[PDB]
Symmetry: D2
Subunit: 146 residues, 4 copies
């Protein structure tokens, strides 16, 4: 994989306008709603029986913040996401046995959330940069399976 300098600039610049305290819960909650089978990885998170329960669940919001904060840190290591995600790959793959295909689904949900928060600013070219970003994150997190 390879990020162009324009990919870097776009990822870094859009991410600087993202409010992680909102986006985190919105992204994980949306994943749990839209692709419900992913809820089986979060039985300890309490009520996930309805969309309103999921989007208002305080554990979902707290954990989505963690997710996006790790992504925010990863954006400072665009040219070595594999090394940067190595310990999270061991966690998700050797420990939790998360299906690699779900890392792609979360990427799709993040892209949706960015489209919602930025509207027209999320141009085709910007979406392409971020589609490359979430695909590279999925590849880096599933590395222990590969």
């Amino acid at each position: 994989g390879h990020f162009t300098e324009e990919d870097k600039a776009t990822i870094t610049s859009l991410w600087g306008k993202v409010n992680v305290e909102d986006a985190g819960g919105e992204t994980l909650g949306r994943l749990l709603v839209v692709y419900p089978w992913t809820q089986r990885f979060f039985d300890s998170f309490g009520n996930l029986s309805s969309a309103s329960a999921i989007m208002g669940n305080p554990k979902v919001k707290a954990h989505g913040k963690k997710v996006l904060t790790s992504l925010g840190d990863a954006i400072k290591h665009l040219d070595d996401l594999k090394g940067t995600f190595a310990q999270l790959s061991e966690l998700h793959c050797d420990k939790l046995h998360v299906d690699p295909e779900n890392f792609k689904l979360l990427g799709n949900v993040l892209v949706t959330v960015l489209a919602i928060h930025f509207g027209k600013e999320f141009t085709p070219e910007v979406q392409a940069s971020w589609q490359k970003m979430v695909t590279a994150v999925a590849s880096a997190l599933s590395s222990r399976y590969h």
Copy 2:
């Protein structure tokens, strides 16, 4: 598959507020930009070597209009997408040999387009209804292969 009455209400309701003519060109254009290999099916449209050339291209816009018009008409037949798309499944599969994965990618870009236009109105539930929709469209379009 099966659409719920709530899925139908959401799909019909949001689609009535879509500008098919612009949304179609935006959806096809984004597909070509975000998943570049799809450009190989549209060599006759012209130079598609950049986002600006793709999004400014009149044939992309005119064809996107056809695509979303057809999708719109399918929304009158949500319990029978397979039958309603039978002729277009023969065209895409037996004559154009479009990879079935590409029907899913176009569906994913439409969902991004709807998220951009509708913003916070595209709640997790609404996205779930549309994810189901674009999944069912891709199944109906690839029926000839299955």
Copy 3:
């Protein structure tokens, strides 16, 4: 989708020569070995931390037998897999929350198992018929999600 008379003849004909009891344990066992994350749905079967422990495990063998038996019975209803698998789609989707991608992975392993057992008899055409079959099984099993 649609099975051809040649698809039906091939599927029924080869399946009559399958040893469901051994093939089922081999198919489930391989799924668990080749796509390790699937082990998380079968924690109650015991230690699945190696291929030898998985392939020697009596519960894997006994459950694989159920899976292929059910598949075998579905082969009596090739024009109506959705209806024939309705109850198992509710079980897998609404209760067990099995990711839809996993139904496709089990289908891919069954095709490998059939290739191992039948060798040159599993010609490209025969594989095509079975690929269609295991694709249609996965669609019917994930119907509750779509």
Copy 4:
């Protein structure tokens, strides 16, 4: 990604028993038969209108030999497939616009061909090594898209 030494030994040892002059055409022909839309990338190859035409087509056989000879060379660089496939990624991605998902399908077809040629020798553990191998090859060939 990471190959274990056991993965290396298995990949190298099985590959040494493979007859590329047969396997090459059998693998590409099978891909063209089982996933027919891939035939659109080979219009110059002549008759691909039937399974017998495809499996007997001399261009398909000649090109499948090239494919597996490149893979055979790649097996001598297991720990750097990305660098080893860089020029083929530029060819397949920037030039030919092959869908990354097809590189996974060819991997699935190769695994089928190995299962056919080796039968029981293709144990679950050996399949797992080779599933990792064809997945890493798909990732290395699609690198220019990523």
